[PDB]
Design a protein around this ligand. Structure first.
Ligand SMILES: CCCCCCCC/C=C\CCCCCCCC(=O)O[C@@H](COC(=O)CCCCCCCCCCCCCCC)COP(=O)([O-])OCC[N+](C)(C)C
Ligand SMILES: *[C@@H]1O[C@H](CO)[C@@H](O[C@@H]2O[C@H](CO)[C@@H](O[C@@H]3O[C@H](CO)[C@@H](O)[C@H](O)[C@@H]3O)[C@H](O)[C@H]2NC(C)=O)[C@H](O)[C@H]1NC(C)=O
Ligand SMILES: *[C@@H]1O[C@H](CO)[C@@H](O)[C@H](O)[C@H]1NC(C)=O
Ligand SMILES: *[C@@H]1O[C@H](CO)[C@@H](O)[C@H](O)[C@H]1NC(C)=O
Ligand SMILES: [Mg+2]
Lengths: 1035, 328
């Protein structure tokens, strides 16, 4: 049980309590070099190349130089180490900035500065306005009355609206002064640290009395104090026990599915390589037993038994056939990934003009996974919306306004300019004042609210706990009715540039169940007005019979509802002088606790708001980013399922669901209570919600569904499995009121119980956990903190740019990768297996069929450039056709271009090509090549024929593969062939290529290798044309 | 973030390009023109190869009931073997005399590498210091072997002489040239004697002969042009073959001054000195006589390969044409 003693530096120093410094980095200045263990072991190819480096080091078993493998090996490990060094070094700069944030602490005697590191459990602190909370503190006092503090929890949930927080009454009236805080000695026995944000169980033992605590009294670390000059508190949790830091996940090293596929499809090559070398080694043991011992010309001293000779070349055939898993593949992929990533940065169609913020591929290793996405988990506010909640229309009195009929806003000096109101009839009517109901409507908006004024540097900025209320007051200010200021007992309003102060005498509270709020404002003349504002349903239940505008306003509400705009009916009253005086005495009696204070308040509240008169309803538009509704439908056609994980309340999350067209009139909403019946029903027994197609679950209900002994774990796994299957079959799932860790929990749930590839997109510190958890993490630019941007693989400002990331850059990146891998495995299997076929004709003695130089430069100069430009400049369809035809994305989601079937087909193609490249020349050299004094039929000329036929064959195979023949593609393909012949024609072996029979053989081995490919490729597309083929055919 | 990305063709992935589609109007021709070009070339190769006269005598004498078995157990070191063959059709033009060896793996790894390339080039530094690469024959007892390595040690040292059995039954010797039977590059670039001096004796001082060679590299041939590392027979042997069965050029029978054929049809007897033992590893020495052809040599496999490939390509296009017609 956590125990906190105020201003006792050595309470626990007598491990459990953590100092208030944080660490998100992974490496120190020394243990970074041991990062190789996370590269070597995770990727077996790295281990295998290390084996070759060790294998080629010992001269007793060697057939190739070991420097040719160390240099590529360092590049493969070097780039990934430098790539991960900058990533961690960046994490060190941000951690230092957070740690070096300054605060104030009660040291011995007084408040003196102490950085965030120096904060510890049970250490009283003082925080000013617009200052970050350093640790989960207990509010003890504040500069404003009743020790009341408003804090913006922009990181716990990605919302700018202020949160109400109240300190204990006992601490309110004693710890106001600095001196009393120093001598304060309060003992707290609270709950152990956990990731829950909205719940806090504990007590404060002080002055021989225990005071229970609640989440309202506890400020959290990832919050900023606002609208209060200063506040005091003592830390409860610190450093890593802070609820923000417990709502975080590890920075796992993210690898592509293709990278995982190559792991299992490179184990296969190792097994074949061992079997081939072991198979040939056994053959040489028998050959040396019979033919090698009696062959006097082969005697070389150093008598080795035939078993030992076979043993020695088993390694000798490992180096000879090592190119089956070439190291050049993992060196070229670095170029392919880096080049593909830089196309995202250079994209002008993903460049945001007014913010001047082009996209950024912050992780180049995951380029091809953008073509694999099955799910998208998106934050709501800031990602789908602009965080701008404007006031769009108002049905004041009976007539609807704001319909572009016939603004400067210069007539009032208080016009901030945020509003973009276009209609001019409203402006003319207000100044003319021919209808008093217009003035009362906007005056109400500046009266019935809880908005707060700033007046910072002469700017009348507004901050409010309800974003809708802030928009209304901001809307009212633009139309002349400015909310100047407010003290406890009176409220000041500027009407058309004229000062006007009212003495408020009652403020009805706002509650979720209440669905409305009201304010009794006493006019200076003497009139009493009960201004009211609330939802249309509750408001219409409490109108006077005289109201003739009920139906007309109701019609307007439908028009606003069709446009997906929130609506709030406005009303007032004309309470008499004596009428309220009796009620005021009753109302004061209701302020006391009495028994509960709920029924007493709830009762009297009902009779206050009866017999009202209706002005109309407002239309608050929660603005969406441009192209968001088009994006969600565009990606829906790609068979991508979009989930909205948001920290906003249910009604706000549901409303944006309809604005984005995630939810429609067809969809029937399944709420938390409805699901629990289904999940329990399945336990006591695909899911019916497959027909419902929508899912709106609060974060509180996720805990009940998740339920967060061996038998208990069995239910845990089954209960998690049931929810995911139910959730995954719905068209849209919206998870509201979810903590930052609950955002990553759902991403983990989908990944684990569906094996789906997930994309997490969002902005702000709220979404960092799911951005770090999903396979692909996207960070929307715009947040000043730059916390989701820095932890995301990719980052661009708008949401509509997700169309190009997935359908253009991710679709091509998958196609280009798969074409690269399949050909690169082909060109080396064909190249390296000629040593296997030649084994039967040289005593299984591990003699290469090519000259030594051709072994080194095959993957450097002769076949390196054509495949790199195919991995960077290959487009099946243009970008427009990629976005015009979203269905092509399904190719990557289903893993069609790279599999075991497609991998072994490349091996089969490589094996046969090697068979043809060796056995067609063999027929032409077994008996007689063009023979005379100056003639081939050497070993050098035999090696030249296979090398020449191999270079042209593979460089002609890539020519078939590249469907986008840029001039560089043509130059590289023909330049690689021309370069090969240029090198070996003095810029010996040039004698072989200067005869007809050698060229006739080379012309044959090339055609026999390629003509079956042309026939097979032509038949495959004709009989079974792919979706890209159809569009190309109909292009 | 940063300024606007530059607008260029490469960066925006809008480089000019041509998209090639494997339309039936393009694959079908390249399956018929190829099937139409390879057949005439396949007939040209096949018809010309069959017009090249060739007689090949296998004189290893492994099988009893042959007049050459006596040399399989050479009690007396100089063994002479004689075999009679008949030329039914007179050879025309230049006639090339090879020697063949079967089941003789000159492409073994331990054998192919077993030479010192630097020494053969005339590297005086390596002349008396052969590399580790020719380890088993680096030094005989104390001083180094000049042609080090297994490749030079196991040189083919049989002597072949051609005799024409004329109408008078008196054997007529046939002129055989031992010059110009190696690559021009090999004589003048790859293989060279050690620099300095005028006599080959002083150049090869302090260097023993290979253990298997009867005489050192001093006097491989009488002519100074054809002795030393620049000897034609030595050069031709070191030029390693690619497969176990190979044949290496041995002599040339240049065009006769008179109009009559170089080797008129009749009875011929080959007088061969049996020196090279191969029967231990089931080898088979052979002598081959071939006549020059304008288009290289005699290669039937390429002929049938083009008739097969030229025919197969023609059939595939027809099958593709039929399949295209159904799916047109
Ligand atoms: C017109 C004529 C064109 C043709 C000529 C010029 C083409 C040059 C252009 C491109 C190709 C450049 C060569 C890269 C070769 C790939 C790596 C490789 O194969 O490793 C090889 C060695 O390689 C080395 O030792 C040097 C590696 C240096 C890394 C350079 C990164 C690539 C830069 C790219 C710049 C992109 C620029 C993009 C521009 C838009 C060995 O690999 P392996 O054989 O598979 O290993 C198996 C055997 N082993 C285990 C025993 C070792
Ligand atoms: C032609 O070449 C062959 C090689 O194929 C020569 O036969 C080899 O001759 C050498 C000696 O000249 C043999 O080496 C050793 O000889 C001693 C006797 O001096 C003997 O005691 C050793 O046991 C060993 O044999 C070598 O063994 C032998 N080859 C084989 C396979 O046994 C031949 O001498 C050459 N002839 C001419 C005329 O150049
Ligand atoms: C081969 O020819 C020689 C000499 O011409 C002769 O002595 C010998 O009998 C001949 N052998 C056969 C089998 O005819
Ligand atoms: C074959 O050559 C040898 C060596 O010159 C010679 O002695 C012999 O008479 C020749 N003729 C034969 C063996 O018929
Ligand atoms: Mg957000």
């Amino acid at each position: 049980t956590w125990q906190v003693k105020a201003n006792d530096r050595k309470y626990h120093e007598q491990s459990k309590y953590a100092n208030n410094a944080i660490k998100t980095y992974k490496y120190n200045a020394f243990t970074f070099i041991p990062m190789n263990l996370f590269e070597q072991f995770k990727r077996a190819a790295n281990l295998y190349f290390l084996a070759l480096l060790i294998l080629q080091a010992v001269p007793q078993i060697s057939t190739l130089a070991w420097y040719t493998t160390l240099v590529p090996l360092l590049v493969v490990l070097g780039v990934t180490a430098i790539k991960d060094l900058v990533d961690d070094v960046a994490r060190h700069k941000m951690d230092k900035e957070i740690n070096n944030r300054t605060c104030e602490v009660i040291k011995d005697g007084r408040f003196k500065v102490a950085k965030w590191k120096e904060i510890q459990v049970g250490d009283v602190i003082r925080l000013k306005k617009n200052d970050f909370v350093p640790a989960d503190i207990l509010l003890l006092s504040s500069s404003e009355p009743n020790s009341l503090c408003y804090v913006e929890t922009a990181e716990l949930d990605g919302e700018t609206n202020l949160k109400f927080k109240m300190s204990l009454e006992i601490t309110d009236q004693y710890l106001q002064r600095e001196d009393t805080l120093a001598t304060f000695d309060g003992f707290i026995e609270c709950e152990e640290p956990n990731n829950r944000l909205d719940k806090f169980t504990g007590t404060l033992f002080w002055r021989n009395t225990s005071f229970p605590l609640d989440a309202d009294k506890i400020l959290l670390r990832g919050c900023v104090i606002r609208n209060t000059d200063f506040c005091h508190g003592l830390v409860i949790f610190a450093g890593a026990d802070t609820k923000i830091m417990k709502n975080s996940g590890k920075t796992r090293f993210k690898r592509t599915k293709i990278d995982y596929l190559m792991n299992y499809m490179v184990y296969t090559i190792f097994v074949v390589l061992i079997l081939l070398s072991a198979g040939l080694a056994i053959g040489h043991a028998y050959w040396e037993a019979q033919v090698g011992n009696s062959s006097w010309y082969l005697y070389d001293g150093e008598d080795d038994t035939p078993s030992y000779r076979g043993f020695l070349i088993f390694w000798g055939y490992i180096i000879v056939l090592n190119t089956m898993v070439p190291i050049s593949l993992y060196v070229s992929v670095e170029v392919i990934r880096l080049g593909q990533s830089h196309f995202i940065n250079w994209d002008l169609q993903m460049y945001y003009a007014e913010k001047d913020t082009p996209a950024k591929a912050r992780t180049t290793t995951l380029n091809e996974q953008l073509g694999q996405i099955h799910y998208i988990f998106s934050d709501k506010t800031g990602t789908l919306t602009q965080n701008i909640m404007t006031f769009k229309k108002c049905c004041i009195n009976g007539q609807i306004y704001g319909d572009h009929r016939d603004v400067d806003f210069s007539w009032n000096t208080y016009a901030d300019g945020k509003l973009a109101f276009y209609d001019h009839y409203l402006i003319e009517q207000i100044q003319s004042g021919k209808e008093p109901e217009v003035r009362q409507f906007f005056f109400l908006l500046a009266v019935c609210h809880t908005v707060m004024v700033d007046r910072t540097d002469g700017q009348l900025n507004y901050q409010a706990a309800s974003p809708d209320e802030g928009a209304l007051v901001n809307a009212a200010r633009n139309f002349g009715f400015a909310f100047l200021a407010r003290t406890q007992n009176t409220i000041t309003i500027s009407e058309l540039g004229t000062e006007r102060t009212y003495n408020v005498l009652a403020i009805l509270d706002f509650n979720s169940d209440r669905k409305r709020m009201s304010i009794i404002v006493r006019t200076p003349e003497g009139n009493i007005k009960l201004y009211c504002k609330g939802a249309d349903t509750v408001i219409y239940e409490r109108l006077h019979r005289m109201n003739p505008t009920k139906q007309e306003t109701q019609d307007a509400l439908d028009i606003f509802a069709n446009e997906t705009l929130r609506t709030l009916c406005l009303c007032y009253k004309e309470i008499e002088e004596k009428e309220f005086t009796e009620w005021n005495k009753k109302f004061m009696a209701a302020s006391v606790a009495s028994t509960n204070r709920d029924e007493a308040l709830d009762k009297v509240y009902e009779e206050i708001e009866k017999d009202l008169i209706l002005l109309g309803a407002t239309a608050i538009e929660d603005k969406l980013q441009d192209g968001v509704p088009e994006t969600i439908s565009k990606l829906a056609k790609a068979d991508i399922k979009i989930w909205v994980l948001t920290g906003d309340k249910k009604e706000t999350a549901e409303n944006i669901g309809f604005a984005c067209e995630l939810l429609t009139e067809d969809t029937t909403i399944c709420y938390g209570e409805d699901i629990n019946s289904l999940l329990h029903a399945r336990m006591e027994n695909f899911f019916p919600p497959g027909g419902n197609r929508a899912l709106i679950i609060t974060g509180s209900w996720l805990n009940e569904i998740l339920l967060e002994k061996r038998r208990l774990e069995a239910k845990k796994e089954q209960r998690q499995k049931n929810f995911v299957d139910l959730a995954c079959e719905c068209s849209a799932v919206i998870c509201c009121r979810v903590t930052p860790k609950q955002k990553a929990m759902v991403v983990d749930l989908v990944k684990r119980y569906k094996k789906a590839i997930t994309l997490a997109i969002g902005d702000g510190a709220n979404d960092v956990n799911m951005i770090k958890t999903a396979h692909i993490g996207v960070g929307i630019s715009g947040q000043e903190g730059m916390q989701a941007v820095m932890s995301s693989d990719y980052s661009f400002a708008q949401f509509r740019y997700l169309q190009r990331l997935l359908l253009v850059h991710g679709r091509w990146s998958y196609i280009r990768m798969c074409k690269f891998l399949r050909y690169f495995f082909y060109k080396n299997f064909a190249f390296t297996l000629v040593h296997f076929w030649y084994s039967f004709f040289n005593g299984y003695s591990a003699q290469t069929a090519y000259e030594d130089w051709f072994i080194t430069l095959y993957n450097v100069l002769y076949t390196s450039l054509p495949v790199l430009l195919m991995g960077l400049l290959d487009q099946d369809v243009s970008d427009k056709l990629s976005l015009r035809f979203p269905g092509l994305y399904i190719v990557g989601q289903r893993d069609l271009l790279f599999n075991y079937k497609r991998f072994f087909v490349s091996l089969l193609h490589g094996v046969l090509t090697s068979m043809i490249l060796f056995f067609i020349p063999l027929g032409a050299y077994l008996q007689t090549v063009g023979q005379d004094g100056e003639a081939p039929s050497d070993y050098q000329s035999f090696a030249v024929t296979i090398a020449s036929a191999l270079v042209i064959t593979v460089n002609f195979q890539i020519g078939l593969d590249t469907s986008y023949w840029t001039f560089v593609n043509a130059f590289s393909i023909f330049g690689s062939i021309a370069l090969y012949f240029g090198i070996m024609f003095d810029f010996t072996a040039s004698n072989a290529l200067r005869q007809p029979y050698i060229w006739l053989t080379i012309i044959l081995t090339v055609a026999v290798c390629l003509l079956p490919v042309v026939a097979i490729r032509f038949l495959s597309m004709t009989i079974w044309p792919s979706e890209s083929d159809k569009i190309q055919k109909h292009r | 973030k940063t300024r606007r990305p530059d607008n260029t063709a490469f960066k925006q992935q809008r480089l000019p390009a041509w998209q090639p589609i494997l339309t039936a109007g393009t694959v079908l021709p390249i399956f018929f023109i190829i099937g139409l070009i390879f057949i005439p070339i396949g007939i040209g190769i096949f018809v010309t190869s069959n017009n090249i006269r060739e007689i090949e005598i296998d004189y290893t004498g492994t099988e009893p009931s042959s007049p050459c078995n006596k040399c399989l157990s050479p009690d007396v070191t100089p063994c002479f073997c004689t075999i009679n063959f008949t030329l039914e059709k007179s050879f025309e033009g230049n006639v090339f005399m090879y020697y063949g060896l079967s089941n003789f793996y000159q492409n073994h790894r331990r054998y192919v590498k077993s030479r010192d390339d630097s020494q053969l080039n005339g590297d005086s530094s390596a002349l008396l210091n052969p590399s580790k690469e020719c380890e088993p024959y680096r030094r005989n007892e104390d001083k180094p072997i000049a042609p080090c390595g297994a490749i030079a040690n196991s040189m083919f040292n049989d002597t072949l002489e051609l005799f024409l059995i004329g109408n008078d039954s008196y054997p007529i010797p046939i002129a055989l040239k031992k010059k110009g039977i190696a690559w021009w590059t090999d004589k003048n670039v790859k293989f060279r004697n050690p620099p300095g001096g005028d006599n080959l004796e002083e150049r090869f001082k302090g260097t023993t002969k290979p253990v298997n060679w009867l005489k050192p590299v001093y006097m491989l041939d009488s002519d100074p042009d054809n002795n030393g590392f620049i000897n034609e027979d030595f050069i031709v042997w070191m030029r390693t073959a690619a497969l176990p069965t190979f044949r290496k050029l041995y002599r040339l029978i240049e065009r006769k001054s008179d109009l009559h054929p170089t080797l008129p049809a009749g009875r011929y007897s080959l007088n061969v000195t049996y020196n090279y033992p191969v029967h231990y590893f089931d080898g088979r020495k052979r002598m081959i006589l071939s006549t020059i052809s304008w288009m290289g040599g005699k290669n039937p496999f390429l002929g049938i390969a083009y008739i097969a490939v030229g025919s197969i390509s023609f059939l595939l296009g027809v099958v593709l044409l039929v399949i295209n017609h159904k799916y047109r």
